[PDB]
Amino acid sequence: MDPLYGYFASVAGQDGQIDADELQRCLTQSGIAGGYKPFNLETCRLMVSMLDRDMSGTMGFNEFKELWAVLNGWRQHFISFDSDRSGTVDPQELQKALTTMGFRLNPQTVNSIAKRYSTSGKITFDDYIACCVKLRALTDSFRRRDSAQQGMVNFSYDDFIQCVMTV
Amino acid sequence: MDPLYGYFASVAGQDGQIDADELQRCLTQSGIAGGYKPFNLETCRLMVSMLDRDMSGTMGFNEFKELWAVLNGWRQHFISFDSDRSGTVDPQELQKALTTMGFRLNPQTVNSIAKRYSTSGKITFDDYIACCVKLRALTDSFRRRDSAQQGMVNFSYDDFIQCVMTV
């Protein structure tokens, strides 16, 4: 029996699928934020997108399982830059943080990202996560199309729009 | 004198620049929702972002006037699909709404977005605008790079990520 199945079973529908609302509820019940403020609906809708390679708009337990482990790792990284347990990190940390967790980005990019994701000059745990989710999803969709890994993908307007608007 | 000046002057700070929060307050003050619920912060940050092309996270009064005009124009098309002034619209409507917004996308593509922006089955006014705002910003970012107007843009990974993560 999977330690996570209980939470899932609790909100999941008879089809074994949960939506962003339900996801947020069991993520909350799982206590994964562990200390920090539980994630919010919009952030959860994004986690759904990152694992919904179906346009189903829901996820199943195997996915829930995978999500939880990713999230748990990211919270670990974040905590390491949250010396003072504040639930926020500042813009400069984020460049170091983003970099040091499997993300392959140049300094410029990281800074603009750090920028857009700041509220009052700091970046909260929740926003840090949302950033990482969306960052992982888009990199997956990119890699998907970069079938020669040239770090170059020739989008078509419609593909570019649907690809990004759905994440 | 632009009729809009009074609201802007009301919230704008020293240098006549307003951030997402202040924009939220004058769009509200201006009464553009006109019955529907006031836009929430995140949708406003998205607006400020669609207009701020130097990531200062603010806009002047000329930007405010542009936005207001565009917004008001979008709520007009919304208003016609929402006869019962419920405040929402359903997926199948959206496709027709965006088509006549002047967007030019795939029926299939409009569907995935329509799905993604659906909630409880319908799309709220606010999400309708968050969608339009984002669509506008992304089509602008794509055109920029499609100078020979092919309908195709060969993105680099860091440009792609940079472009999308900041909208």
From Swiss-Prot, chains A, B:
The chain holds residues 33 to 198 of 198 of the full protein. Keywords: Calcium, Cytoplasm, Membrane, Metal-binding, Phosphoprotein, Repeat, Sarcoplasmic reticulum. The keyword DNA damage does not apply. Its main location: cytoplasm. This is Sorcin. Residues 2-33, 39-72, 69-104, 103-138 form the EF-hand domain. Phosphorylated; partially. GO terms for cellular component: membrane; sarcoplasmic reticulum membrane. Homodimer. Interacts with GCA and RYR2. Interacts with ANXA7. The modification Phosphoserine is found at residue 147. Changing residue 74 to G: Reduced affinity for calcium, resulting in reduced interaction with ANXA7 and strongly reduced modulation of RYR2 channel activity. Ca(2+) 1 binds at residues 52, 54, 56, 58, 63.
